[PDB]
Amino acid sequence: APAPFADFAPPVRPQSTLRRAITAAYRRPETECLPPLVEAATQSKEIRDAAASTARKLIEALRGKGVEGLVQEYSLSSQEGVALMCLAEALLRIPDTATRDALIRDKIADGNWSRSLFVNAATWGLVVTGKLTSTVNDRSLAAALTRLISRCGEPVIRRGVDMAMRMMGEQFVTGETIREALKRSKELEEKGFSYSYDMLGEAATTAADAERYYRDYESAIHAIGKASAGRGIYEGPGISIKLSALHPRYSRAQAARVMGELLPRVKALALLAKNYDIGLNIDAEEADRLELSLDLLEVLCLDGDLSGWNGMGFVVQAYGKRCPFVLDFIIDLARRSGRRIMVRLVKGAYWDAEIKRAQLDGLADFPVFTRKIHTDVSYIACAAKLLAATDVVFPQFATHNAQTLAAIYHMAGKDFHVGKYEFQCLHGMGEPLYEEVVGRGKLDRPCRIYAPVGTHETLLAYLVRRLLENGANSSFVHRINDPKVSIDELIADPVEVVRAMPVVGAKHDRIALPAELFGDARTNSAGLDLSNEETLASLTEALRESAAMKWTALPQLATGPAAGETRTVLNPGDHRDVVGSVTETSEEDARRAVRLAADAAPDWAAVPPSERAACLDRAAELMQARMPTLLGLIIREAGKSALNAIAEVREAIDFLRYYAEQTRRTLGPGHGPLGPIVCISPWNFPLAIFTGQIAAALVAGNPVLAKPAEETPLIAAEGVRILREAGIPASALQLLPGDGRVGAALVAAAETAGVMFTGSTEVARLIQAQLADRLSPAGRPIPLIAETGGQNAMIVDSSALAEQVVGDVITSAFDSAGQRCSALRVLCLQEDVADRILTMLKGALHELHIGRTDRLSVDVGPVITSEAKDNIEKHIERMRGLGRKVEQIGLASETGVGTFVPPTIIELEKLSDLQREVFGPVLHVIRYRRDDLDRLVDDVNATGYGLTFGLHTRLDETIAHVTSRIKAGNLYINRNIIGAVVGVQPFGGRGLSGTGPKAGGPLYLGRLVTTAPVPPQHSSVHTDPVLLDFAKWLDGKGARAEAEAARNAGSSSALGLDLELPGPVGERNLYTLHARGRILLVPATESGLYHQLAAALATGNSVAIDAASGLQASLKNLPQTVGLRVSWSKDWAADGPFAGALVEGDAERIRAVNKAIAALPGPLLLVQAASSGEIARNPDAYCLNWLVEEVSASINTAAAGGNASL
């Protein structure tokens, strides 16, 4: 048996001093990065004066010289221009130019114009307006297209087709094929330009895609080398490649596959480039790939088979904090290898994405600068370093910024020869600038044009966004065309502007560090960067040390540890790996624990809320400090990967801090505790959900009996140890390890005042049935918060981006071996794109690494137990036996020592083929016709579940349709459907998925006290109109007090609350309160009924009223608006599902009704009960908090390949 974590993440090679200097700078504070850059970029006054003059002359030339003229000629609105260009693009998809012309003339121009015409309207919107949107208003565009065609007819359509042709075939790309691009390059090559060709391609998701990009590159190298015809690496053309195009798993976590599989591919291409003596440049991609790419560069430059060739090139991004240290490494590598490495200095293309990623991952700082002027100084500083090393490297200064250009032109001085350095620019953007540079009549410096090649609609869209800087106001390309921006502004020297600032290198004031995402409310949890070699080295040691510890879990009662039966805890991924020992709780001691909690309840309720919250905050600090050790335990006890364990510890920290802050915002002495709360937690989030339930109950003033899942007691014991260390008294937090019999004893105990349960719907139903026999001392039902299964779907239409879909599906379905309650279970693919997406999904499936999770390279770990494995596999085999197509990855023999299920894709005929939640790595796929979208949504709702739901579409009309009809608590647009963030996507659903309130949301604590507080921002100015009609009807009937109570309910309701929650950039996180549905009303008196009806109507609900109440004659002559919401039910089980219940009666009647409600099939109903007297005395007898439904929606607004606002 391999020692745990002995091979967790060994580096490709021992890290040299130069490599460690790079890693040290990864997230260095911006105020520390800039001063040495300012120093290195400093030039003499005479040079600065000369550069400003040259920059002014270039900009004057640039300003002294398509779609805009088309918009002018036909008086098009912006939307008409966008719509016209979408039409033109589609018409160009028709090959036969004659068949197209007759379509325009005889069909389109008249009045009759598988995929929306407007799938790429975001791209054209950027072309037309300079602004990027994530999604497109396809109804607006359709209206605009109809309007413009009916107004201007065939002429405007032909003009649009001509314009789209000129842009898509001549301005965005140098050619559609490498042969065409090479032919079109002769003109500027005669004028002194050179070329670097980019076969559009990146981010391979499958082996097949990586192989396709490989043969694209190989064929392009042959064509470029044939055309170069011996011109060599400086005067002749070269190629640019992206490493992510050549392997579907290009990441540090997969470094072994990268070195073993990607490296030989790059070597083979470079050998071909060597034979033709052309340049081969490695483009720079995301920040977490920088240092990995250096390992490939080093191996390539030291490989003797490539000797004799100086065409290897490498991009370095000056917006990156490591840039100068990367350059030091490359210059030294050039000296060691004797190869004159071609170094392309760029600013960088992924800025918006890097900001969002660092925020999502909770890392210390950004790996890029946050002020644009800092990147400019960085670039000039790095240019000075390169210009000092032209003997050993070939600098290539890629920029369209005339100030940057002029600074470097003058920095380089008067001595020039071809091969010393060059400038570079992008095709169809840089030529106007660089035609003022190239040639003896200008500045006589060469420029290499980066020349995109292809027709790839997706990659074409990616490029147009890169070419237009995602529509950024800070970009030179935008500012050069901005008449409000003077030339003096454009030639401002960034070095001296930065030097003059109060704090040199201060972070952008409007971008939050990841720790500061929530401002003054609370401190964001911190993650770990698994691409950082220093982090990986330190984590390896911490993880090894965690595995040497003798972890234990014992019954921890208020009186001390208790004795019991002890057994070992085994690693689910390798049962030979003993993780620790658990001593399990006797039923008698479980009962004793509840009595001890009851005895201690007044003492804990007496601790002021802010001090209870301080315990949670202290526990959060402890968990953060202990994160590496906690990771190791979670990895081995629960079978989780490192990344998932980090996210879990982060979530536990976030729960602690969020409930602490919510307590500080809300709780006072009048919000009395329930009493002892039984917290029953699952094995799949054995720290986060465990901690969240307990922290909420504790901070609300209740003592807790914590019953962890039998599979994962050790991390629970560690969580309790930390909470107790943080100041939670032992009498307030007791740990009761064991199986469901321990849970059952706790639930049944007479002093149990509330139960928080996360687990299966079936166990939740058993708990509900036991609780229904009891009442609180105040004669109310015992509160149950139950978060249960999901049958979570994602709907993908033909406008979605397949590569994005595939990544989000693989992650949502198979992360944590599908053992997330939020996991994607049913993928619904529009028929027109189903086959292409399914092919990619199957290819991506086979790139997953399944195994014991103490290796960074493992993507998917084991399932928790042999019983789990057996249950999942029985489902797969039943599906397979029914003739459904089943795709599975083959598992390695090493998995035989643990309990693994291979990630599996099952193609279903109908959603009804799936009858129950299968809690494992099993994705079901169905196809749908576009016109059946609404029925599909009905079918998704018909499962009875409602937890998570995903939608991938670019079309606003589809977003509005689907999100208005789906009934789920957590919606995700154009992103994965997992990993809900506390206070950002408050988490919890409806129906079979649970009772609410949402964990990590603002209604949670209020369920854990006897008088609910007003949550922060919890109000609505909306009044339900049927409530208002009902209140008028009451007044008409003479029920004056009830009418007043109804109006008051209408005002007090928070129905219609519509909030945006603070979160990361590039995402919009919305939180809304809706009606729950149909509420079961069980009144005893006429006035009781009227109060119940007002409560339900004020929160937007319809009702079913118990016909056995005999109160039918109390609702005579209802307004139709109210009557439409009222039904009468004799057989409650026949008239559901309900979404809640209101009950009136004395204690015996409440108990009898509560038991009858627990027997209703389907969802667990949140039941509220009150006596007739309580209804008369207490305006809040029924709490409106529990009569609305919380919905969280998270929209990825970077999904159109850019962040507009940022």
Ligand X SMILES: NC(=O)c1ccc[n+]([C@@H]2O[C@H](COP(=O)([O-])OP(=O)(O)OC[C@H]3O[C@@H](n4cnc5c(N)ncnc54)[C@H](O)[C@@H]3O)[C@@H](O)[C@H]2O)c1
Ligand Y SMILES: Cc1cc2nc3c(=O)[nH]c(=O)nc-3n(C[C@H](O)[C@H](O)[C@H](O)COP(=O)(O)OP(=O)(O)OC[C@H]3O[C@@H](n4cnc5c(N)ncnc54)[C@H](O)[C@@H]3O)c2cc1C
Query: Quick one: 24 or 511, whose CB is closer to ligand Y?
Result: 511
Q: How far is residue 334's CA from residue 341's CA, in Å, rounded to a whole number? A: 6
Annotated binding site for NADH: which residue ranges?
681, 683-684, 707, 710, 759-760, 787, 917
All residues at 6 or more sequence positions from 226 whose CB lies less than 8 Å from its CB, including other chains: 276
The answer to whether 399 contacts ligand Y (rule: CB under 6 A) is yes
Q: How far is residue 972's CA from residue 1096's CA, in Å, rounded to a whole number? A: 29
Q: Which of 10, 11, 130, 153 binds its own copies (CB under 8 A)?
A: 153
**H or E segment to which residue 331 belongs:** helix 323-337
- 190 part of the active site: no
Query: Quick one: 318 or 622, whose CB is closer to ligand A1BDD?
Result: 318
Q: How far is residue 398's CA from residue 379's CA, in Å, rounded to a whole number? A: 10
Could you say which residues in the range 346-405 bind ligand A1BDD, by CB under 6 A? 349
From the candidates 86, 323, 447, 821, give the one annotated as an active-site residue.
821
750 burial via Cβ count (<10 Å: 0-12, 13-18, 19+): exposed
Question: Which of the choices ligand Y, ligand X, its own copies, none does residue 683 contact, using the CB cut-off of 5 to 8 A by kind?
Answer: ligand X
Could you say which residues in the range 226-265 bind ligand A1BDD, by CB under 6 A? 242
Q: How far is residue 922's CA from residue 899's CA, in Å, rounded to a whole number? A: 15
Could you say which residues in the range 466-495 bind ligand A1BDD, by CB under 6 A? 466-467
Q: How far is residue 180's CA from residue 161's CA, in Å, rounded to a whole number? A: 21
The answer to whether 298 contacts ligand A1BDD (rule: CB under 6 A) is no
Shortest distance (Å) from residue 395 CB to ligand Y? 13
The answer to whether 283 contacts ligand Y (rule: CB under 6 A) is yes
* 151-162 as b/e: b if 16+ CB within 10 A: ebbeebbbbbbe
Annotated binding site: which residue ranges?
284, 317, 344, 347-349, 351, 370, 372, 399-401, 466, 469, 474, 476, 681, 683-684, 707, 710, 759-760, 787-788, 917, 1158, 1160
Segment interacting with ligand X, rule: CB under 6 A, options 402-410, 566-574, 661-669, 681-689: 681-689
The answer to whether 610 contacts its own copies (rule: CB under 8 A) is no
Q: Which of 1017, 1112, 1127, 1178 binds its own copies (CB under 8 A)?
A: 1017
The answer to whether 433 contacts ligand A1BDD (rule: CB under 6 A) is no
Q: Which of 54, 123, 359, 404 binds ligand Y (CB under 6 A)?
A: 404
Sheet holding 904-907, edge to edge: 885-888, 904-907, 922-928, 824-830, 792-796, 948-952, 970-973, 1188-1196, 1067-1075, 1058-1061
Could you tell me which of 1138, 1120, 961 has the C-alpha nearest to residue 1025?
1120
The answer to whether 445 contacts ligand Y (rule: CB under 6 A) is no
Shortest distance (Å) from residue 693 CB to ligand X? 10
Question: Which of the choices ligand Y, its own copies, ligand X, none does residue 147 contact, using the CB cut-off of 5 to 8 A by kind?
Answer: its own copies
The answer to whether 1190 contacts ligand X (rule: CB under 6 A) is no
- 1183 part of the active site: no
Segment interacting with ligand Y, rule: CB under 6 A, options 271-279, 364-372, 413-421, 802-810: 364-372
The answer to whether 761 contacts ligand Y (rule: CB under 6 A) is no
Segment interacting with ligand A1BDD, rule: CB under 6 A, options 105-113, 279-287, 615-623, 935-943: 279-287
Q: Which of 80, 209, 469, 797 binds ligand Y (CB under 6 A)?
A: 469
Q: How far is residue 720's CA from residue 405's CA, in Å, rounded to a whole number? A: 61
Segment interacting with its own copies, rule: CB under 8 A, options 310-318, 362-370, 851-859, 1010-1018: 1010-1018
Tokens linked to 267: 């070597």
Could you tell me which of 946, 933, 878, 940 has the C-alpha nearest to residue 911?
940
- The DSSP line for 1037-1104 is TT-HHHHHHHHHHHHH--TT-EEEEP--TTEEEEEEEEE-SEEEEE-SSHHHHHHHHHHHHHTT-EEE
Q: Which of 702, 799, 974, 1114 binds its own copies (CB under 8 A)?
A: 702
All residues at 6 or more sequence positions from 101 whose CB lies less than 8 Å from its CB, including other chains: none
Q: How far is residue 1197's CA from residue 132's CA, in Å, rounded to a whole number? A: 10
Which amino acid is located at 463 in the chain? L
Sheet holding 566-571, edge to edge: 551-553, 574-583, 566-571
Q: How far is residue 512's CA from residue 522's CA, in Å, rounded to a whole number? A: 13
Shortest distance (Å) from residue 426 CB to ligand A1BDD? 5
261 burial via Cβ count (<10 Å: 0-12, 13-18, 19+): middle
Question: Which of the choices ligand A1BDD, ligand Y, its own copies, none does residue 404 contact, using the CB cut-off of 5 to 8 A by kind?
Answer: ligand Y
Q: How far is residue 760's CA from residue 680's CA, in Å, rounded to a whole number? A: 11
Query: Quick one: 297 or 747, whose CB is closer to ligand X?
Result: 747
Could you say which residues in the range 504-533 bind ligand Y, by CB under 6 A? 508
Shortest distance (Å) from residue 742 CB to ligand X? 7
Q: How far is residue 1008's CA from residue 731's CA, in Å, rounded to a whole number? A: 18
84 burial via Cβ count (<10 Å: 0-12, 13-18, 19+): buried
All residues at 6 or more sequence positions from 1101 whose CB lies less than 8 Å from its CB, including other chains: 1075, 1076, 1077, 1078, 1079, 1125, 1139, 1140, 1187
**Phi and psi dihedrals of 785, rounded to 5?**
-105, 115
Annotated binding site for FAD: which residue ranges?
284, 317, 344, 347-349, 351, 370, 372, 399-401, 466, 469, 474, 476
The answer to whether 929 contacts its own copies (rule: CB under 8 A) is no
Shortest distance (Å) from residue 37 CB to ligand Y? 12
Q: How far is residue 575's CA from residue 877's CA, in Å, rounded to a whole number? A: 25
Query: Quick one: 466 or 1032, whose CB is closer to its own copies?
Result: 1032
Annotated binding site for NAD(+): which residue ranges?
681, 683-684, 707, 710, 759-760, 787-788, 917
Could you say which residues in the range 708-727 bind ligand A1BDD, by CB under 6 A? none
Q: Which of 27, 371, 869, 924 binds ligand Y (CB under 6 A)?
A: 371
Strands 1188-1196 and 566-571 turn out to be: unpaired
Site residue total, its own copies (CB under 8 A): 89
**Is residue 923 a contact partner of residue 825, using CB atoms and an 8 Å limit?**
yes
Provide the Cα torsion 344, 348, 354, 356; round to 10°: -160
Query: Quick one: 351 or 900, whose CB is closer to ligand A1BDD?
Result: 351
Q: Which of 140, 684, 976, 1168 binds ligand X (CB under 6 A)?
A: 684
All residues at 6 or more sequence positions from 488 whose CB lies less than 8 Å from its CB, including other chains: none
Question: Which of the choices ligand X, its own copies, ligand Y, none does residue 450 contact, using the CB cut-off of 5 to 8 A by kind?
Answer: ligand Y
Helices (H), 104-137: 109-111, 121-129
Q: How far is residue 144's CA from residue 121's CA, in Å, rounded to a whole number? A: 12
Q: HSE (CB half, 13 Å, CA atoms) of 997? A: 25
The answer to whether 456 contacts ligand A1BDD (rule: CB under 6 A) is no
Which amino acid is located at 461 in the chain? A
Query: Quick one: 300 or 1167, whose CB is closer to ligand Y?
Result: 300
Q: Which of 81, 311, 555, 789 binds ligand X (CB under 6 A)?
A: 789
The answer to whether 217 contacts ligand Y (rule: CB under 6 A) is no
Per-residue x/- track, 45-84, its own copies (CB under 8 A): ------------------------------x-x-------
Catalytic positions: 787, 821
Q: Which residues bind ligand Y (CB under 6 A)?
A: 283-284, 315, 317, 319, 346-351, 368-372, 374-375, 398-401, 404, 424-426, 450, 466, 469, 472, 474-476, 508
Q: Which residues bind ligand A1BDD (CB under 6 A)?
A: 242, 283-285, 349, 426, 450, 466-467
Q: Which residues bind ligand X (CB under 6 A)?
A: 680-685, 689, 707, 709-710, 739-740, 743-744, 747, 758-760, 763, 766-767, 787-790, 821, 917, 919, 947, 987, 993-994
